[PDB]
Amino acid sequence: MKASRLYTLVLVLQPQRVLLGMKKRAGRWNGFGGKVQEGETIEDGARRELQEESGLTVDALHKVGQIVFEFVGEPELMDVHVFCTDSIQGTPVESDEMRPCWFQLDQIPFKDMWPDDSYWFPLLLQKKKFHGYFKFQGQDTILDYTLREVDTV
Ligand SMILES: Nc1nc2c([nH]c(=O)n2[C@H]2C[C@H](O)[C@@H](COP(=O)(O)OP(=O)(O)OP(=O)(O)O)O2)c(=O)[nH]1
Numbered sequence: 001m002k003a004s005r006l007y008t009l010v011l012v013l014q015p016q017r018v019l020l021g022m023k024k025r026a027g028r029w030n031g032f033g034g035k036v037q038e039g040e041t042i043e044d045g046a047r048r049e050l051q052e053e054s055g056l057t058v059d060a061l062h063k064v065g066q067i068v069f070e071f072v073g074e075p076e077l078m079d080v081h082v083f084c085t086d087s088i089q090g091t092p093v094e095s096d097e098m099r100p101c102w103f104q105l106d107q108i109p110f111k112d113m114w115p116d117d118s119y120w121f122p123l124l125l126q127k128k129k130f131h132g133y134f135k136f137q138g139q140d141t142i143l144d145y146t147l148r149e150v151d152t153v
């Protein structure tokens with residue numbers, strides 16, 4: 001089994017809207033996140049990436065899922081720990097890396113999101129917790145995947 005590298009993903013989910021960021025360099029909407037760094041907890045890494053990529057600070061996050069990504073031709077898995085929050089207290093800021101944008105929850109931009117999001121995003125919206133795995137060929141093609149609702153992440 002391949003080694004895996006730790007990542008975070010943060011979704012700011014309010015009652016009628018969700019905050020996504022457009023990757024400027026890419027072209028897809030996503031939550032905010034990145035690699036966990038040495039010596040920080042996964043949750044603290046998620047808080048740090050949220051602040052670095054969107055400008056938003058939150059004191060706490062709720063872990064809602066975990067997704068492992070495998071890419072054909074790449075030696076490592078990406079182990080993505082997915083967090084939510086409903087409570088923010090500043091404005092999102094656009095950088096040269098991510099442009100934040102709010103979407104109403106009847107306008108989730110799936111056509112411009114990664115293909116796996118179509119499977120697990122609906123569980124997140126239902127307040128369900130999940131474990132997923134997706135094997136991609138390139139950016140567009142899923143060759144294999146698993147997804148399961150769990151009571152504990
Ligand atoms: N919704 C969704 N999110 C994904 C998928 N694959 C995937 O890596 N992510 C998330 C997890 C990561 O936090 C982020 C990709 O990490 P990144 O490449 O932006 O990491 P980074 O910013 O630290 O790297 P760098 O370019 O700044 O050096 O996107 C996916 O298929 N769907």
Ligand code: NA
Nearest residue numbers: 033034049053
């Ligand atoms: Na980042």
Ligand code: NA
Nearest residue numbers: 032033034053
């Ligand atoms: Na990132």
Ligand code: NA
Nearest residue numbers: 110111113115
């Ligand atoms: Na899509």
